[PDB]
Design an enzyme around this catalytic site. Sequence first.
Site: not given
Ligand SMILES: O=CNc1ccc2[nH]c3cc(-c4ccccc4Cl)c4c(c3c2c1)C(=O)NC4=O
Lengths: 261, 261
Positions: B17-18, B20-22, B52, B136, B153
């Site tokens: 939850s962000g 730029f982007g959920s 970017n 980062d 990320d």
């Molecule tokens: O709670 C269990 N797992 C969990 C919880 C919160 C999360 N937030 C995320 C952001 C990301 C993420 C961060 C930056 C860019 C793209 C993504 Cl999908 C990811 C993940 C999680 C993630 C995984 C992941 O498992 N693989 C990821 O690439």
Amino acid sequence: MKSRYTTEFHELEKIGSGEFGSVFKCVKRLDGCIYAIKRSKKPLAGSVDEQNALREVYAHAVLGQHSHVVRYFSAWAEDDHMLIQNEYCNGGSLADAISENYRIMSYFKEAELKDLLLQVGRGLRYIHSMSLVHMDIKPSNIFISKVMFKIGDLGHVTRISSPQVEEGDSRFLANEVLQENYTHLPKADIFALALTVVCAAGAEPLPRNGDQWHEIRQGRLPRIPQVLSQEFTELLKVMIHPDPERRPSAMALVKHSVLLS
Amino acid sequence: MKSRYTTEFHELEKIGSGEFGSVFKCVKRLDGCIYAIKRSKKPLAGSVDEQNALREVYAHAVLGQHSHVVRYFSAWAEDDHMLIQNEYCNGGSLADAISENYRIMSYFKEAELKDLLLQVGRGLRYIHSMSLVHMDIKPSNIFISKVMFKIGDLGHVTRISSPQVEEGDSRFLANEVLQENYTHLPKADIFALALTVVCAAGAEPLPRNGDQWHEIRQGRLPRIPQVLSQEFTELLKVMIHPDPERRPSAMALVKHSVLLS
Ligand SMILES: O=CNc1ccc2[nH]c3cc(-c4ccccc4Cl)c4c(c3c2c1)C(=O)NC4=O
Ligand SMILES: O=CNc1ccc2[nH]c3cc(-c4ccccc4Cl)c4c(c3c2c1)C(=O)NC4=O
Ligand SMILES: [Cl-]
Ligand SMILES: [Cl-]
């Protein structure tokens, strides 16, 4: 029109050409990368043939973390086709490497054969630890990318305690599997790997049936046109032992002293 | 309607939850697997912001072979959104693990911190050998899946000789990078890893600016509420040295005697 396949990828050439399904070398337009994409006819639906097509997808989707298994990216359905998008291995198959070696009379040397045996064996160790077996280990299903060897073509993959099996290529097929005896499925991948390594050592094309076929299944190595260490040769021979309980497991193979180096 | 996202996946919950982007936890309907999917606003097009966004895609698409980097499966564009489909790491982020440790007064022990340091360091060794840097490194960008630590990320990833850099989180930022001095970019990922490990050791929340910020950048470790070996502590301290040439490279880190075990 406008399938995902057409919109998302640029098709570069056909690289594989089959009974069920052509394979293309394609560039994904968004990420810039080359992928190998299999486009196969979409089976009847609810059919025995569809279940077998979906095991390949399910197989690939739990076998995505290993250096010695071809990585999977996506699979989907559109038209009357199923598509699977996989890692492109730029050295092609082991079968073409062997075929080129055959014509030039220069084969894999003992050190290169140990490296092949060890790499594919790490691949198998992982598959087997997922309680799966491959069931079609052969040079045309090993891809080359240090060279790296990767197991691909997960089309015969089943769970290890499976009561029904789709039998792999005859030339690589362990006899207990021909005799519908599925008590040690992993040892059939072991048997097929040994024969994969023999082909890489410069052996003549393996027999599909007849008396030469049965002679190998009695535990006798095909003729290899190069001198191998006794220890190395012993390990290959044990890998095709008639009693599959005698064959090493994939873990025992990769920890073998002969492969230490 | 009917996007690829909606057709291909079942969205299970929002996990991120962000600005730029959920990010969602989703099951791909065809393969049965869970993926983490980032759905971000699609940037203006030809824009600085789009370049970017596409480095993240390009980064992920060459950083797909490593155990200590989050695996990438696909990325696409539809509506006014960009989507990237990544490996789901089921233990969540290192930041939440640390946060939970903080409340219970039970932190990573020296052996667990060495394992974290070593794992992420193998991740970095690989990134850096692709002539890329991450830019980062921090606990909320390290994911947990033996626990495995995976760098995710890739949104600040750049080439190592890059003349322009998007600076990472302040709390993890090496001073030469603040001073627009990009001569040893890899050593900024090293500096950020040391501080990641300090947070895991039970440190108070790091400062964003002010006098405590500058005191760390002079090469002084934040207070750690547990006794660490002198050797381990020395290695952390060298990793935040003001002279980035003094900091170990990622290769020197993973081969370090302290991490042997
Ligand atoms: O709670 C269990 N797992 C969990 C919880 C919160 C999360 N937030 C995320 C952001 C990301 C993420 C961060 C930056 C860019 C793209 C993504 Cl999908 C990811 C993940 C999680 C993630 C995984 C992941 O498992 N693989 C990821 O690439
Ligand atoms: O020539 C260079 N590389 C090459 C040449 C011919 C090929 N045929 C293939 C079939 C396959 C393949 C085999 C069975 C099922 C699905 C595929 Cl994509 C693959 C590849 C190749 C391949 C790769 C590959 O690189 N990754 C693969 O998964
Ligand atoms: Cl073959
Ligand atoms: Cl954080």
